[PDB]
Amino acid sequence: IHRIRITLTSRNVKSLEKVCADLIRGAKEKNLKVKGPVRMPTKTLRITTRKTPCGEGSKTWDRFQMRIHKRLIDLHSPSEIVKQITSISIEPGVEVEVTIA
Amino acid sequence: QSVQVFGRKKTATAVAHCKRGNGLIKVNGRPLEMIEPRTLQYKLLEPVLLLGKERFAGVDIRVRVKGGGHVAQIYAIRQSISKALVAYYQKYVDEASKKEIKDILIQYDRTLLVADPRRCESKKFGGPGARARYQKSY
Amino acid sequence: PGVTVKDVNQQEFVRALAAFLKKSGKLKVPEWVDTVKLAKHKELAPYDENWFYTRAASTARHLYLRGGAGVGSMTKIYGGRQRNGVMPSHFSRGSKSVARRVLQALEGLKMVEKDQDGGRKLTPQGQRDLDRIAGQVAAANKKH
Amino acid sequence: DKLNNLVLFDKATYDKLCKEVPNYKLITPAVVSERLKIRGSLARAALQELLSKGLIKLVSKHRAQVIYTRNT
Amino acid sequence: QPIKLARVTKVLGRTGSQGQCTQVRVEFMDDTSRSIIRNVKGPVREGDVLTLLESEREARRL
Amino acid sequence: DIKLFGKWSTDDVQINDISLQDYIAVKEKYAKYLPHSAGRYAAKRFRKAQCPIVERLTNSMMMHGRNNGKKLMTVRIVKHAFEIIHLLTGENPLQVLVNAIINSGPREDSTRIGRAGTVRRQAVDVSPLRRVNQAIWLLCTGAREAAFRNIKTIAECLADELINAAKGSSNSYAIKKKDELERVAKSNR
Amino acid sequence: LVIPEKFQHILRVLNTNIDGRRKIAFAITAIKGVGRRYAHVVLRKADIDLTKRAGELTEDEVERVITIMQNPRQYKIPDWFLNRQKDVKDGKYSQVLANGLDNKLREDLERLKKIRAHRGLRHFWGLRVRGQHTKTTGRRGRT
RNA sequence: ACGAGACUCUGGCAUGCUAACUAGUUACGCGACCGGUCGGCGUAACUUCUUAGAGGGACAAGUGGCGUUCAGCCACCCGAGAUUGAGCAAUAACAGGUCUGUGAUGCCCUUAGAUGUCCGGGGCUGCACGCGCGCUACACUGACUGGCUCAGCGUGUGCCUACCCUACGCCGGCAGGCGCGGGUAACCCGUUGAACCCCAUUCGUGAUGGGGAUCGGGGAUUGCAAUUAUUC
């Protein structure tokens, strides 16, 4: 089968959407039937940390939250074409997992 | 046909599929006369007998429910039924009696059409609850 | 239109499936059924002498509702409030052995069949018996 | 403290109980226990037994609210 | 202990040590010509009617 | 029809307070088949009076850190004693309820009044809203203490207190509280 | 079987007197080991109706209950379900009724002090067995 | 001008719009009723039903009563919404705690006689009592046989990291042995079937069933080392 799946994950929604638009245009630059970007639920990671290094004062905490936004682009094409589209200076912080089955 | 327009309360929701059927209202494989709490059945028969049991003349309404809490599902299941009745009565048939029944159930209450925007707030640290704080030490 | 499985109060429906069970006289009861603790969150011994048959009825009814669901899931349904006195009460699992024994009791009697990806399903004979029971309770008052 | 109540079967559950509960208009295990000097637990047990005999009209049942009224 | 009617027409203000009462102006319906002042306790709506033991009472006035 | 619980008629109530039906209402269009509509009136002001008073009851005999979060139990327990007053007095429970709300409802209270003194109290008029609030509070306090640790169950202690407060009988704990309020109003002019 | 008049205040253990006001499945809690779910299960499998009360407590009931509490293997009940499994200082497996024989086993304070064991010294002063840490906090004992 | 406000995520209407095969209800039989009803699901499949995108929307904008008639305040109809909650928070300062947080650090004991450092066998693991955050309750709005059945953030097999969740057969009440596998993840548990409640069981004013808070034995899984049955 030639259905190549890009599991692309990044911390920024705007950079993620720019990557997705560029990738889907590069697919749209060629003759490749594609599906729309599939947005899996963003992982919200919570870390609640006491602020004072030594326990003193009012009970105060910081709440660091990590938003991880993940799109999938599965296109009906050999992975070589997708790699040809890939060399476009991918946005930093956007990681790509390649799925071939 | 799917003229469903939500019908919600808290985080639980109902979708009222409506068609030209038998006039029997179904709630996920069980009749509205038999619901798990065994206590809010009147809250479910309120809309139909308030507007009139005679209105249903061959309309099959299946509501599918999903969300947390039984009573939270109610006030939305019945809201979904009222929404489906509104959609059916707006699609083809007149509006004068539609406005009549709408005025009657609006003066009856407000939670039959418009959803309650309320929701459970977060809890703030430094206390047992969102607004409650711990006891002062002297 | 006939009779559907869920159109009669489910409490009396499980009671009627239990009644079918104790008029059938088919099941088997082992000899460790009163010497065990049989529960974690239940603090008193059963006073009904017949909890095995009602357990079988509940298991069969849940079996119709759930496909591919096997041992270990009903014991979470049978678990509940475990109070430790001063300790705040928690949710504790019920008795896995009781559920497994009642399952093996119903297992192989054409009510419960073994699937091929894990868990269990019901045979058409068991479904027909359950539907006949549901029709019985419906015709008791709801179909007349 | 001290648990001491009537646990004896004598002319208190049949006589003056089956002869004074039917003649009253409100019948409750608490009402029967209070107005007829009887134990509420045995009041419930005897009310269940006489309901099995079939000499009352039941509206609804609960752990603390079993609603009876005169029928015959 | 005669009892007559009184209904609110002007909420003069809030009184009390910690906002206990409302100094309010009330007219007697049976006479519709007299206005008196009362430190009424509780949430008061402009136009509510209450049955009263008193028909001449006054409180601290400023 | 809009009868309460589908069994108690609502077209029979008479408040007989000339003009008080806007602050004690069971006939109003907000009065529904059940007293359960979830809390929406407490947010704003003078909207609490728009509540169907059946709801105010089922939430006022709903307190004390052991009941909060158990409103379906309160609705079951009001169905109980509604069908019990249906037989005890042989009349609609709404009539005895309005009688209780019209008699137990206080008029005179005593409060600290002044900007510079703390010696004594002054008589004050309790508004209809606060009067129904504290009257229902006294009723519920009695009904809790009347079945507290007692063999008497709910829906009968509440029932007894309601009936002997609705007729104006001073034997009621709520009516004795009303008399105490009136007498302390007398003794602090 | 069923009889309106069998209510007696005393059950026989060692000719001592007990209470007889409690109902069935609760009147045999007067025995040290019997009670809780033990009495519940013996009455449950005793093949009798449990709706009976204190007044309908027959002598045949009491005799069968005494026999069933003598040895647990009437319905194949293991010994650990009783308060005493294999005994200490003797190779028995049963709980003994009355006083002066079972309570003799419980006195466990001297011999562990011979080996300077902590358990015996802890039970010597009447301290805590569950291990309740004691620093200053506690509101029982002297006030 | 800084701060407040504004800002941003949002809670809350997207029936309009890009759009899923890790999402989901309806065109023909799969085991039943002369037309109705399944989370083993029927061939067929549309974004309404969950996620996550752009734009829109709410402004004291509309009416009425007050107001130095202004800034504003109070009522009312529509409307999802007429005060959703929090992080950012000034100038300037403390002799408030932290040198027992730190491979950021100041004369004294420390100059190898090195308050743990390789190995590691006790220590903040003590009993007479004072309102230090809190814990299950004192009961019949209820613990209690069990009937029915509704959750949302999450956390999840891995650098001197076994051990993480965890779908069945056999056994074993109690924890757990091997396997076919399911999981880098909305694919696997999951439809968190859950859990509070939905009141058919002895219960009745108690020392028993509110109140395991006070005894000795035994199976044992991560733990060479549970000695104060520490924890199943």
From Swiss-Prot, chain A:
Polyubiquitinated by ZNF598 via 'Lys-63'-linked ubiquitin chains when a ribosome has stalled, initiating the ribosome quality control (RQC) pathway to degrade the potentially detrimental aberrant nascent polypeptide. Deubiquitinated by OTUD3 and USP21, antagonizing ZNF598 activity. Ufmylated by UFL1. The modification N6-acetyllysine is found at K18, K59. It is found in: Cytoplasm. GO terms for biological process: cytoplasmic translation; positive regulation of signal transduction by p53 class mediator; translation. Its main location: cytoplasm. The modification Phosphoserine is found at S77. It comes from the Eukaryota. Component of the small ribosomal subunit. The ribosome is a large ribonucleoprotein complex responsible for the synthesis of proteins in the cell. Component of the 40S small ribosomal subunit. This is Small ribosomal subunit protein uS10. It comes from Homo sapiens (Human).
From Swiss-Prot, chain D:
The keyword Ribosomal protein applies. GO terms for biological process: cytoplasmic translation; ribosomal small subunit biogenesis; rRNA processing; translation. It comes from the Eukaryota. This is Small ribosomal subunit protein eS25. It comes from Homo sapiens. The modification N6-succinyllysine is found at K11, K53. Its main location: cytoplasm. Keywords: Acetylation, Cytoplasm, Ribonucleoprotein, Ribosomal protein. Component of the small ribosomal subunit. The ribosome is a large ribonucleoprotein complex responsible for the synthesis of proteins in the cell. The modification N6-acetyllysine is found at K2, K11, K19, K25, K53. One of its GO terms (cellular component) is nucleolus. GO terms for molecular function: RNA binding; structural constituent of ribosome. Belongs to the eukaryotic ribosomal protein eS25 family. The chain holds residues 42 to 113 of 125 of the full protein. Component of the small ribosomal subunit. It is found in: Cytoplasm.
Swiss-Prot record, chain E:
It comes from the Eukaryota. The modification Phosphoserine is found at S35. One of its GO terms (biological process) is ribosome biogenesis. Keywords: Acetylation, Cytoplasm, Diamond-Blackfan anemia, Endoplasmic reticulum, Nucleus, Phosphoprotein, Ribonucleoprotein, Ribosomal protein. HAMAP family: Ribosomal_eS28 (MF_00292). It is linked to Diamond-Blackfan anemia 15, with mandibulofacial dysostosis: A form of Diamond-Blackfan anemia, a congenital non-regenerative hypoplastic anemia that usually presents early in infancy. Diamond-Blackfan anemia is characterized by a moderate to severe macrocytic anemia, erythroblastopenia, and an increased risk of malignancy. 30 to 40% of Diamond-Blackfan anemia patients present with short stature and congenital anomalies, the most frequent being craniofacial (Pierre-Robin syndrome and cleft palate), thumb and urogenital anomalies. This is Small ribosomal subunit protein eS28.
UniProtKB/Swiss-Prot annotation, chain G:
GO terms for molecular function: RNA binding; rRNA binding; structural constituent of ribosome. The modification N6-acetyllysine is found at K92, K104. GO terms for biological process: cytoplasmic translation; translation. It is found in: Cytoplasm. SUPFAM superfamilies: S13-like H2TH domain. Keywords: Acetylation, Cytoplasm, Isopeptide bond, Ribonucleoprotein, Ribosomal protein, RNA-binding, rRNA-binding, Ubl conjugation. It comes from the Eukaryota. InterPro entries: Rbsml_uS13_C, Ribosomal_uS13, Ribosomal_uS13-like_H2TH, Ribosomal_uS13_CS. There is a cross-link at K89, K92, K104 (Glycyl lysine isopeptide (Lys-Gly) (interchain with G-Cter in SUMO2)). GO terms for cellular component: cytoplasm; cytosol; cytosolic ribosome; cytosolic small ribosomal subunit; extracellular exosome; focal adhesion; membrane; nucleoplasm. HAMAP family: Ribosomal_uS13 (MF_01315). PANTHER family: 30S RIBOSOMAL PROTEIN S13/40S RIBOSOMAL PROTEIN S18, SMALL RIBOSOMAL SUBUNIT PROTEIN US13. Component of the small ribosomal subunit. The ribosome is a large ribonucleoprotein complex responsible for the synthesis of proteins in the cell. Component of the small ribosomal subunit. Belongs to the universal ribosomal protein uS13 family. This is Small ribosomal subunit protein uS13. It comes from Homo sapiens.
